[PDB]
Amino acid sequence: YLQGYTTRDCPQAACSQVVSMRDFVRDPIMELRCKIAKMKESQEQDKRSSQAIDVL
Amino acid sequence: NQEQAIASYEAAKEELGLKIEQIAQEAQPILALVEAQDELQ
Amino acid sequence: KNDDINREAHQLNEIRKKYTMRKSTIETLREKLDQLKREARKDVSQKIKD
Amino acid sequence: RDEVIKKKNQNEYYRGRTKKLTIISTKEDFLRSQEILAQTEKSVF
Amino acid sequence: VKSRFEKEKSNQAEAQSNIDQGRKKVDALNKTIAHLEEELTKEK
């Protein structure tokens, strides 16, 4: 989103904050959320995929 | 058919085990820890 | 005539046993493999929750 | 952390209950018998 | 590299599980084929 320009507005909707790469820092909270969500989905998907093969 | 499957399983697992033994032998090293310790002291 | 009818009987007996063979395929591959795969799961929610 | 890596590998027993696994024979065996049902009688014998 | 080796060992465990499943299927099919061989003699 910030590619090609030094600073650009915040990509989120209704946000006008002009940001750059240095303005963004690693978010441990988002990694935690996505990690947890993906692991839950992975457990669900492994069970679903196994039964998804049991169908064939 | 099941005996053929068993033979294929055995061959594939033998090959995999050889490769895994090689990779385990390749898993020696652990880096910047020594340099950090030296700089600290 | 008797020999001809006997040959026909043997052909139809082999046909019926091929049918029984397909029935055996049903019983083992259709069901025994189905049961083995169904129980092999042991509801993986088991090992997952372990 | 080491056990974290191990348990991630155990989640990759995704293939552990997914890849190893029922009805492929079941669907076809029906077709095998249905086709062979028309083929075939003990009363005739 | 140790993580990669452990991943490979997990693949080894999956292969061994496949081997064991094949062994169980082979044994069951041996029992069934022996049974049907016995039956065929039961059923010039």
Side-chain angles (χ1 to χ4, degrees), chain E residues 22-36:
Chain E
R23 291 171 180 173
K24 305 154 194 174
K25 299 166 187 177
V26 161
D27 301 357
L29 291 178
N30 296 339
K31 302 152 193 173
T32 57
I33 196 264
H35 165 61
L36 295 196

Side-chain angles (χ1 to χ4, degrees), chain B residues 9-34:
Chain B
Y9 290 161
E10 293 169 356
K13 202 270 165 55
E14 291 163 358
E15 172 191 6
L16 288 181
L18 204 161
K19 296 179 176 178
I20 296 155
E21 178 182 2
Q22 164 264 327
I23 293 182
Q25 190 176 0
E26 204 258 351
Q28 173 57 37
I30 303 176
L31 200 84
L33 168 66
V34 184

Side-chain angles (χ1 to χ4, degrees), chain B residues 13, chain D residues 13 16 20, chain E residues 12-22 24:
Chain B
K13 202 270 165 55
Chain D
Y13 262 75
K20 293 155 202 170
Chain E
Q12 159 191 358
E14 181 185 24
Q16 184 56 39
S17 173
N18 292 268
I19 290 194
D20 302 328
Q21 294 165 335
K24 305 154 194 174

Side-chain angles (χ1 to χ4, degrees), chain A:
Chain A
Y1 191 96
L2 310 167
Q3 181 184 7
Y5 302 85
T6 303
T7 53
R8 295 181 66 175
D9 302 335
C10 175
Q12 198 110 10
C15 194
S16 59
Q17 291 283 352
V18 190
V19 291
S20 57
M21 287 304 303
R22 59 179 180 179
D23 307 325
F24 274 84
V25 294
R26 176 183 177 270
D27 183 295
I29 320 295
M30 247 61 176
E31 306 191 3
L32 164 51
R33 305 165 184 278
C34 298
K35 194 167 161 189
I36 291 186
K38 292 160 192 174
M39 288 177 39
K40 208 158 199 171
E41 296 169 3
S42 69
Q43 268 195 10
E44 299 170 4
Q45 292 163 5
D46 294 6
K47 296 169 184 177
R48 292 170 58 182
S49 180
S50 301
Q51 294 172 358
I53 310 299
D54 273 328
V55 183
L56 302 177

